[PDB]
Amino acid sequence: HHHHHHMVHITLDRNTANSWLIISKDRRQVRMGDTHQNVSDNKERFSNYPMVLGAQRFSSGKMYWEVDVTQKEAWDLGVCRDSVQRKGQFSLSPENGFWTIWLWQDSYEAGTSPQTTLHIQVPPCQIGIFVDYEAGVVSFYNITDHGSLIYTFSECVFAGPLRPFFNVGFNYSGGNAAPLKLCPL
Numbered sequence: 001h002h003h004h005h006h007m008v009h010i011t012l013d014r015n016t017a018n019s020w021l022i023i024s025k026d027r028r029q030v031r032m033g034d035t036h037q038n039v040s041d042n043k044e045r046f047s048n049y050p051m052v053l054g055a056q057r058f059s060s061g062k063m064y065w066e067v068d069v070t071q072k073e074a075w076d077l078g079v080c081r082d083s084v085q086r087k088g089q090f091s092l093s094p095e096n097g098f099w100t101i102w103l104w105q106d107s108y109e110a111g112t113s114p115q116t117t118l119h120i121q122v123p124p125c126q127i128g129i130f131v132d133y134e135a136g137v138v139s140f141y142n143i144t145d146h147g148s149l150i151y152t153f154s155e156c157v158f159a160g161p162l163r164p165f166f167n168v169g170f171n172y173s174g175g176n177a178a179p180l181k182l183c184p185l
């Protein structure tokens with residue numbers, strides 16, 4: 001692809017994080033902590049899942065960023081509406097305001113309802129995310145495989161400002177502690 005020139009510098013918003021997440025000082029990395037991270041509760045925090053939002057809000061234009069997923073077993077990545085539900089149980093779907101892909105139990109899937117199987121020959125270590133607000137497009141690229149397309153959501157109905165969306169995943173197995181990292185431009 002040729003989306004690299006729309007690169008944006010994303011930072012994580014501490015205030016939206018699940019209370020067990022540890023966001024690095026530079027606000028570019030996030031990982032699952034061993035316990036509650038000693039923060040007050042607020043209506044922004046994701047309660048049920050290890051999720052956090054980027055600080056940036058997008059309502060126009062073309063945006064691109066890259067995330068490092070090296071050695072993780074589970075994660076969700078994409079964008080979501082600023083107004084998505086934070087508390088309780090919910091599914092990642094466009095109807096709920098999410099445009100995402102994920103890894104879970106050795107399979108990659110796009111967060112459609114119901115979910116769509118992805119065909120990835122080279123397990124990615126870094127994912128590129130492209131958003132064209134006007135066109136209604138969210139695309140995912142495999143940076144490990146020369147930028148090959150993973151998935152395009154088209155005819156998106158954003159219906160609000162978008163925020164970068166992250167889930168570090170659960171670590172029941174002891175094999176999913178590694179962080180998500182925002183890769184340099």
Ligand SMILES: O=S1(=O)CCN(Cc2ccco2)CC1
Nearest residue numbers: 018020048049050170171172
């Ligand atoms: O992933 S875990 O090993 C450590 C965190 N716990 C509690 C927790 C935090 C957020 C959602 O649920 C689940 C099992």
